[PDB]
């Protein structure tokens, strides 16, 4: 119907022009919209013959320092960022063009990603917008780290950091955020990536965070932070992990109706429990709306 949660996809094609944080090549980024039930797709264009990977969690491969999709030997490195600001905005169907194996850095956050697909405009499409709803308690852990699953009306991603460090210590550890009361762009998007300045110096020499600069992610020492304007947020690390999840989170093909609590959790863990939730069938359903006004989660005007 007319009144359904509808289906989303870019209005008009965007190019945008970056690097690569762990590969450190210049990279061609373009949004292009797609067709119903396409989902999120990344397209290596400078490749002969163009190689197709749906960002979906079967298809995600190394879990390191980023989330990497690949098929057979053709890798989509870093796609967390983009994919946190598609979910964000509720971008269901896209074509993600890359003319190098890692998506863009940018500023470290989701925020220029956000104003790049806000920009090109959003187009609603006559389809209805699949959600997976969270139906029993759902969780993954390894050691002192945890994901989990829980039934909620709606949306909201909890985390919880523990960092041994004195400007980690000083900053918080734990925040809830609940998106039917706050913004994913102006409370979550903008918060940047962080490292370890001592951690950096082993990365960049055993061929990672090639790409790193301060322009691009929260570069920290043991007491404070390098970066001469400081921080966009006073719970940035934290947001930025929310951030991080809700982008890993989306490699399920559609937006979830439930509440993610992370305790020290990565990439891995995140990829692990959408492997762990997918295989257990009794503990998900997938449910349309053909009334936006009943629906628990709502989204911003196309
Ligand atoms: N743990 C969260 C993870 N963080 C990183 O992948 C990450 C790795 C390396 C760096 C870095 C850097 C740097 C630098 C630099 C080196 C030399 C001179 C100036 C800056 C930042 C975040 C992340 O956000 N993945 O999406
Ligand atoms: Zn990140």
Do not use: C
């Not at 290596?44 to 990977?53: C, K, M, S």
């Amino acid at each position: 119907s007319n009144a359904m949660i509808k289906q989303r996809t870019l209005k008009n094609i965007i190019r945008a022009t970056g690097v690569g944080l762990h590969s450190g090549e210049k990279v061609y980024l373009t949004l292009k919209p797609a067709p119903v039930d396409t989902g999120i797709v990344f397209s290596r264009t400078d490749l002969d013959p163009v190689v197709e990977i749906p960002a979906r969690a079967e298809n995600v491969g190394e879990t390191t320092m980023s989330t990497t999709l690949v098929k057979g030997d053709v890798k989509v490195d870093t796609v967390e960022h983009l994919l946190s600001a598609m979910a964000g905005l509720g971008i269901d169907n896209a074509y993600v063009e890359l003319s190098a194996s890692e998506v863009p850095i940018m500023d470290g956050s989701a925020g220029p990603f956000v104003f790049l697909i806000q920009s090109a405009g959003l187009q609603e499409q006559e389809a209805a917008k699949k959600f997976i709803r969270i139906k029993r308690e759902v969780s993954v852990e390894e050691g002192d780290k945890r994901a989990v699953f829980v039934p909620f009306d709606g949306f909201k991603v909890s985390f919880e950091i523990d960092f041994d460090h004195p400007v980690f210590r000083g900053r918080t550890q734990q925040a809830s955020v609940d998106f039917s009361s706050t913004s994913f762009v102006k409370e979550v998007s903008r918060a940047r990536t962080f490292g370890f300045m001592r951690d950096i110096e082993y990365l960049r020499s055993q061929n990672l965070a090639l790409g790193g600069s301060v322009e691009n992610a929260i570069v920290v020492d043991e007491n404070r932070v390098l970066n001469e304007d400081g921080l966009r947020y006073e719970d940035e690390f934290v947001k930025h992990k929310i951030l991080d999840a809700i982008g890993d989170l989306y490699l399920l093909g559609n937006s979830l109706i439930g509440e993610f609590r992370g305790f020290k959790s990565g990439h891995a863990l995140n990829n692990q429990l959408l492997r762990t939730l997918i295989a257990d069938k009794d503990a998900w359903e997938v449910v349309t709306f053909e009334d936006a006004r009943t629906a628990p989660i709502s989204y911003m005007r196309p």
